[PDB]
Amino acid sequence: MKTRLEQVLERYLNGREVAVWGVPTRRLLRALKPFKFHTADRVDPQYHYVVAVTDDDLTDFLSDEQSKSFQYANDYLTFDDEGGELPFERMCFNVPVGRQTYFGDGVVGACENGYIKSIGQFTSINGTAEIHANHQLNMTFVSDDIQNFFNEESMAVFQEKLRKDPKHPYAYSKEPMTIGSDVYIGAHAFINASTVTSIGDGAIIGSGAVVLENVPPFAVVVGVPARIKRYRFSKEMIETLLRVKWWDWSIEEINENVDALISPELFMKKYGSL
Amino acid sequence: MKTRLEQVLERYLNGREVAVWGVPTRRLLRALKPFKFHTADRVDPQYHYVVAVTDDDLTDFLSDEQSKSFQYANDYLTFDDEGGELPFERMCFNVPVGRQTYFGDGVVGACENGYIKSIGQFTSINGTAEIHANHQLNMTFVSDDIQNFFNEESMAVFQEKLRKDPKHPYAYSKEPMTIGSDVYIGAHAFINASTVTSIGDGAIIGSGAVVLENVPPFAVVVGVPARIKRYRFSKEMIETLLRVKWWDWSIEEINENVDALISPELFMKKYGS
Amino acid sequence: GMKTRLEQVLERYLNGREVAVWGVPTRRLLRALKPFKFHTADRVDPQYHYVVAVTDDDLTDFLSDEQSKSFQYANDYLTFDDEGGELPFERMCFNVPVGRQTYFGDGVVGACENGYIKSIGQFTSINGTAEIHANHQLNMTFVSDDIQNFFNEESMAVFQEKLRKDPKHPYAYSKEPMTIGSDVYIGAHAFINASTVTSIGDGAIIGSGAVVLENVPPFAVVVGVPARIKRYRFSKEMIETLLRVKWWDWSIEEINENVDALISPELFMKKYGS
């Protein structure tokens, strides 16, 4: 599956050479195999695309005077930033991720594990958020790695009964969860991939909240376990938001109607009734 | 002390060459000195044991077509994975850890800090679970790093009061914590090492639970603070399980009992009074 | 003119010695070390070399090596990837003064960089997973921040103007950075909201997992989500005695001379109670 960097390079390299800014990794060299690359030294954006390996390397690059002529994404990127935002849709382990949406390594892993169907646009997920599923809870054992001792027959029996568990251990027999648009998820939050299939548009998940059920659109959930504290707007305004879907607007429309985005009062004016 | 990798190599290397998959580190090369090693290029399990440095490197290795013939632990391992499971009983900073038991760096530090006496078999501890002790709560100061300014005279009287503190700051003057077999500890759960001495066999610690006292065998604890939400089985089955001790079974015994391990009702019909 | 933690240590302790790099170097390390003579570490002598371990794992390897036993912390060696690590002298983390023997993790390093923290006191212990973040705006139609990447000049001016007049201080706007006092303890995975908090008082104990939404009085112990006051460490008269005496600003000699009063609260009151 294509990394974030390979997707961006396919868009913007345009015959240039990749300039590696930092110590390379095995994952990086695997991602760069379709491209010509060399260790960075003197870089010019007309001939070079700069790939910082770590966030540390990018900080060093953007402190260098050579970085002044390089534009984000168009001319440079960070390889170890699989959850970093882009102004266009991208895949993360074959999970669609909307524009201006960012998340951390826990959600990257959740995407790799198959727990996520899609992540919406303009969605903000703190880097320490975590998404994981339950082990089986109604067998004699709760361990998962005991299966490393199962031969082919025993594993097939184990896998079949896992698929029949209505509690969806390891997120079996359930839809991967959709994370909506204009969503905010606080630091150290947790979402249970066994029992959650939807984080609705506009939802806010508080810091440290342990989410065990679907979060309705524009609901604000906090606590352990997470419960609804309030809604961001009235139900009439929420229904208007779900009809207008400003997160699908053009960049020109976003600037044209920035006053409605900045003022919920004006938004309900224009769109609530006609 | 013997790292996880050194224990694996002593058991499984079998005269092969260690093929390093990833950037070598100072800690890795010190661990690899007694053995022959090279940067990994073309590898075969007959002549090579693949050591991925980081989990990112292991991800790359398993995506490579060469890894299909390599079996976990027997033929490859991750170096920066001290909490990772092994098919045999291992040590982690002189803490016995049972087969197929894993945990994260936080619990690795707890083993190194002396907070853990042992961890059972087939136990699953989420990578973000953490086990810390309390600082001293009966002094004028709560800082620990102030002791870096203490000379020998001040350090002696500081250490002596910690030793006699009944609340066990830094887990002083108490038994190290035992963690049983078939235990599950969820994401960002917390266990207080100053007060907890046992997580019983089969205990489940839910995501977010803050555990301040011992967890009975097969109890499911949740919440802040942790409370017993339910027990996994009946009283008689718990008693039967503590006598049968399936977590000590051979690999073949486990396979021959897979239906009983899947179905608690069949387990009791077979092993119950 | 901000300086890295390593630069501050080298300026104070290097004393014409040569830096010996212990571990694989990074781009950021090479830039920080370039004003100085440095070599890869082989055989080292603290009389002659200053050992810079790159990562914490490098430091573990160095301290397990025979060559390190004559090396003194900070005076003779340091870890580069340890911006939150304690120093025996008052230091700066970005533009934030940090007291002696005070440590914290990368999240709080980032909070210093973001301008969320005014100062951190002496002998303060902050777990590495503690996190400090501000709120996004909660009075607009959207909660996203990266939507502003699509704002042209005019939309950004309107957006920024409303942020600055928001009394709830989104992104810590229109409020003071928070002052974290001395002798403070902050447990694992604790959260402090940079939008709503301006002071963590001296002696405060923030429990593990606590989400702090309000100012914490001096010597208060707070727990839970949200964090509430559970108790106070000392009596009122003792609290005011401590705030006046300020043992956390004592010299090293004064600390050792009065270790009995630091060990025994009752003796502290007998000696310093007015």
Coordinates of C-alpha atoms in Angstrom, one line a residue, chain B residues 151-249:
Chain B
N151 CA 25.0 14.8 49.7
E152 CA 25.7 11.5 51.4
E153 CA 24.4 12.8 54.7
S154 CA 21.1 14.1 53.4
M155 CA 20.6 11.1 51.2
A156 CA 20.9 8.7 54.1
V157 CA 18.2 10.3 56.2
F158 CA 16.0 10.8 53.1
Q159 CA 16.3 7.2 52.1
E160 CA 15.7 6.0 55.6
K161 CA 12.4 7.8 56.0
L162 CA 11.2 6.5 52.6
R163 CA 12.0 3.0 53.9
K164 CA 9.8 3.4 57.0
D165 CA 6.9 5.1 55.2
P166 CA 3.9 2.8 55.5
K167 CA 2.4 4.2 52.2
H168 CA 5.4 2.6 50.3
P169 CA 6.6 5.6 48.2
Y170 CA 8.5 4.3 45.2
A171 CA 7.2 0.9 46.1
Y172 CA 9.6 0.7 49.1
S173 CA 9.1 -1.9 51.9
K174 CA 6.4 -3.9 50.1
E175 CA 6.2 -7.1 48.0
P176 CA 6.7 -6.5 44.2
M177 CA 3.4 -6.9 42.3
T178 CA 2.4 -10.2 40.9
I179 CA 0.4 -10.3 37.6
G180 CA -1.4 -13.5 36.9
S181 CA -2.0 -15.6 33.8
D182 CA -4.7 -15.0 31.1
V183 CA -4.8 -11.3 32.3
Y184 CA -6.0 -8.5 30.1
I185 CA -5.1 -4.9 30.8
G186 CA -6.7 -2.3 28.5
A187 CA -5.5 1.0 26.9
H188 CA -4.2 3.8 29.2
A189 CA -5.1 1.9 32.3
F190 CA -3.1 2.6 35.5
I191 CA -2.0 0.4 38.4
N192 CA -0.5 2.0 41.5
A193 CA 2.6 0.1 42.5
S194 CA 2.7 1.5 46.0
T195 CA -0.5 -0.2 47.0
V196 CA -1.1 -3.1 44.6
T197 CA 0.5 -6.5 45.2
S198 CA -1.5 -8.8 43.0
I199 CA -3.5 -8.9 39.8
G200 CA -5.1 -12.3 40.0
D201 CA -5.3 -14.9 37.2
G202 CA -7.8 -14.1 34.5
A203 CA -8.4 -10.5 35.7
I204 CA -9.5 -8.0 33.1
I205 CA -8.6 -4.3 33.6
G206 CA -10.8 -2.2 31.4
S207 CA -9.6 0.8 29.3
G208 CA -9.1 3.8 31.5
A209 CA -9.4 1.9 34.8
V210 CA -7.3 3.3 37.7
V211 CA -6.5 0.3 39.9
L212 CA -5.6 1.2 43.5
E213 CA -6.0 -2.1 45.2
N214 CA -5.6 -5.8 44.3
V215 CA -7.8 -7.3 41.7
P216 CA -9.3 -10.8 42.6
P217 CA -8.9 -13.6 40.1
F218 CA -11.2 -13.3 37.1
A219 CA -12.7 -10.0 38.2
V220 CA -13.4 -7.4 35.6
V221 CA -12.6 -3.9 36.9
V222 CA -13.5 -0.6 35.2
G223 CA -13.8 3.1 36.0
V224 CA -12.0 5.9 37.9
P225 CA -11.5 4.5 40.5
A226 CA -11.6 0.9 39.4
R227 CA -14.6 -1.1 40.6
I228 CA -15.5 -4.8 40.0
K229 CA -18.1 -4.7 37.2
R230 CA -18.5 -8.5 37.0
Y231 CA -16.6 -11.8 37.3
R232 CA -15.8 -13.8 34.2
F233 CA -17.3 -17.1 35.4
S234 CA -19.2 -18.7 38.2
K235 CA -17.6 -19.4 41.6
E236 CA -17.3 -23.1 40.8
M237 CA -15.6 -22.5 37.5
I238 CA -13.2 -20.0 39.0
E239 CA -12.3 -22.7 41.6
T240 CA -12.0 -25.3 38.8
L241 CA -9.8 -23.0 36.7
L242 CA -7.4 -22.3 39.7
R243 CA -6.9 -26.1 40.0
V244 CA -6.7 -27.0 36.4
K245 CA -4.3 -24.2 35.5
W246 CA -4.7 -24.5 31.7
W247 CA -2.2 -21.7 31.3
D248 CA 0.5 -24.2 32.3
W249 CA -0.5 -26.7 29.6

